[PDB]
Structure formats: C-alpha cells, structure tokens
Design a protein around this ligand. Sequence first.
Ligand SMILES: [Ca+2]
Ligand SMILES: [Cl-]
Lengths: 91, 91, 90
Amino acid sequence: MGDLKYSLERLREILERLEENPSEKQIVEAIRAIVENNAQIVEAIRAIVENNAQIVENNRAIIEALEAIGVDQKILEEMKKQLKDLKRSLE
Amino acid sequence: MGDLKYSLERLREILERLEENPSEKQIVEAIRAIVENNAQIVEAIRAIVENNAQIVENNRAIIEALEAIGVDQKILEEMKKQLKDLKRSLE
Amino acid sequence: MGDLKYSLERLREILERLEENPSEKQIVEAIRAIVENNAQIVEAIRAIVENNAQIVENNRAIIEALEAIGVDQKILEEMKKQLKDLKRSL
Ligand SMILES: [Ca+2]
Ligand SMILES: [Cl-]
C-alpha cells in the first residue's frame, strides 16, 4: 500500500518526464513503469483477498456465539420456571 | 485473482516482446493489454467491495449478540439474588 | 467504485480513439489516462484497506462476546447445582 503510492509516485514522474520531451524509449519506459505498478496492485489485491478470509471466520464465530446464546436463554427460561414453582411450593 | 495473475503475466510478456523489438503497432498492443488488465482489476475491486458487505452484517450481528448477553447477565444478577434470599429465608 | 468504472470507460474510449488513427500525441494522452485510472485504483485500494480495520474490531468484539458467554455458562452450571442441592435438601 505504501509501495503503491510510491510506485504511483514514480509513475507520475515518468509520465511528466514523457510529457515534457517525448521519445520512443521514454514511452517504453512508461509502459514498463505501468506494468510494475499493475504488478504491485495485483499483489495488494491478493493480500486483501487473503485478509478477507477473516470475514468468513468472524461470521462462523458469530453464528456459534448466537447458537450458544439461544441455548442459554432457553435454560434461563426453564430456570425462571423452576424458581416460581419452588417459591409457590414453599407458599 | 487467478485471472489477474495470468492477465498480468500476459501483460509482462507483451512488454518483453515490445522491449526486444519496438514498434507502433506493438505499442498499441501493449496499451490494449493494459486496458484489459485494468478492466479485470476493476472487476476484482467491485467484487471485493461487494464481499465487504458481510463486514457490516457481521458487525450488526455482534452488536445484537452483545445486547442479548447483557440482558442474560442482568437476569443472572437478579437470579443469583433470588437464590440468596431463598436460602437465607429457609435458613 | 463509480469513479473507477467511468475512469475505465473513459480509458476504453481513448484506446478506441487511439485505435482509430494512431499518433504520438494520442499515445501520450492514453498513458496519462492510464495513470489517472491507476491513481483512482490506488485510492480505491486505500479505502478498502481502511475499511478492513472493521474486520479486526469485529474479531475483538466476537472474542469478548465468547468470553462473556463462557462465564455465563459456568455460572449457569453452578446455578443448576444450587437448585439441585436446594430441592434435595427441602
Ligand atoms: Ca449468555
Ligand atoms: Cl468481519
């Protein structure tokens, strides 16, 4: 990402150097700079996609967190019942 | 992602063919390949942006999970007091 | 993202204009359009990376939720014991 902004920085310069005084070799140099920048972009996209695997892992944990919560609240519902039966048993 | 890497390697190859034997038609070739590669990069980003909606959906679910937990803990706090009174009352 | 598609479409048209009748000036203009498109792509990548920090914050929140649940279930395990002992006693 820091590589990207710099790589884009270099790329704007080569463009500027190309704009002020064209040349065929300067053109090919620009295209080479573009390819290298695109290469870094693809690497940034790859890393993002890899990092996004956590999204799936987070979603699975939430689901299990919710499943455990539902079980707790059914128990609490049954536990609330037991106490009322207990109190009324006493009086 | 796989399309990206191949599309980038196609792109690197054309650059090579351009570097070894420069030409105007080969320059336009290169630029067309770049535009094609950029087009695939954009689709990759759009798909990533689409997938990122799960982040929001995950965040909403965690919040609801925490809200349900706080409720359970409040109930448990009251339940614990009920048993203290029940036991103390009996003994 | 809306900028990207337009930026790419502008780029596609310049290519066509370049393909209509090649020219150095047209070549240089195309390379600039690519640079501008790449510049928008990087900004898009930055925005995604910034947005991705929510993934970490979600993960931390899930962990704290799970930790809180485990505490509840240990308590519930103890509370179920109390009622059993209470009922049997009485
Ligand atoms: Ca709970
Ligand atoms: Cl997430």
